[model samples]
Target: GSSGSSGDPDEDSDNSAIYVQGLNDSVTLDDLADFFKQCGVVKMNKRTGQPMIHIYLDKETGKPKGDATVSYEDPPTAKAAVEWFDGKDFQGSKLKVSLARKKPPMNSGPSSG
Candidate 1:
């Protein structure tokens, strides 16, 4: 099943927006914003380092934490980039990406009851 918006996959010229992966260590926020701007006005783009990377979801009314997600204004853009970059190496590091799932905000309260 296709997760991206239903349309002519080959005809992405009309579609605007795309995803970028395998970003090098030197890649900065400005680079990402610039890339997405080609599709449309880049709404937002963000990333986290390797050591601090984490994606947590609370099942029983818990908070989500450190979950890295990417948003694209157009589906074809995301699909194209994902296909082009999946499992590809960048600066000697492999990149992986997928559709981001919605998560609730993390609770700021203390851990211990």
Candidate 2:
């Protein structure tokens, strides 16, 4: 279950269009834009309860792993965006960059017999 707020009240819920992930657990949207300032101007809604930058932990080691997602307004921006995120840092942790991998489609089948 995707248990997070997707920005834009009127934006389409096409989870396939945009890709976003990995952020400082304590990082806010503002911090994200600042870090990715070179990519383009990114906007984050403060109303979203989840942290803009979440720190991913290894399920086994429990280490702090940096994470981030790419959100570009156009294809060119997206193309350029990928290479830019490499080797970026935030809050003493290296940023982990990669294409957004969407979760599997939820089962909407009717109740079993």
Candidate 3:
């Protein structure tokens, strides 16, 4: 048997958070959790003390940009999430799914010589 999937296994497995595009112009957090929650338990962040559901916002207006990031508790759930909605239509716009861009946490010079 062979098993291959999208996104690099290293990051995808370690970080189950994923980026999604083409959602309703004003998507809600509960709405974001709806479909993905079907695949696996949604993840939460202890640092933020919040569910890992994050939506893009308009720079000035502070409005949703029809995109967001979602996290799952397991790698397989993240895979199912990608497979299920990679191209699904939402409000007539097809979804674009991929691994979320990680902020430069490791290399950032918060304090270094």
Best by TM-score: 3
- What is the C-alpha lDDT profile of model 2 across 26-104, one tens digit per residue? 7655566666657764434369733233344667766534444545455454445555675556676565454454343
Q: Score candidate 3 by lDDT.
A: 0.75
lDDT, ranked from best to worst = 3, 2, 1
Q: Candidate 3, residues 1-113: lDDT per residue as tens digits? A: 45876555354356577788888776788777776676677787779766788888889888888888898887767767877778888767788877674455566647866
Off by over 4 Å in 1: 1-27, 33-68, 102-113
Count of clashing pairs, candidate 2: 9
Each prediction's TM-score against the native? 0.35, 0.45, 0.67
Per-residue error (Å), model 2, residue 54:
9.4
What is the lDDT, from 0 to 100, of the residue 80 in candidate 3? 70
- The deviation in Å at residue 4 for candidate 1 is 26
> Which model, 1 or 3, shows the larger TM-score?
3
Error of 3 at 76 (Å): 1.8
Comparing 2 with 3 on TM-score, the higher-scoring candidate is 3
lDDT (tens digit, per residue) of candidate 1 on 7-88: 6545434333333344554544444444434433433434642221222344664443212334555666555554544565
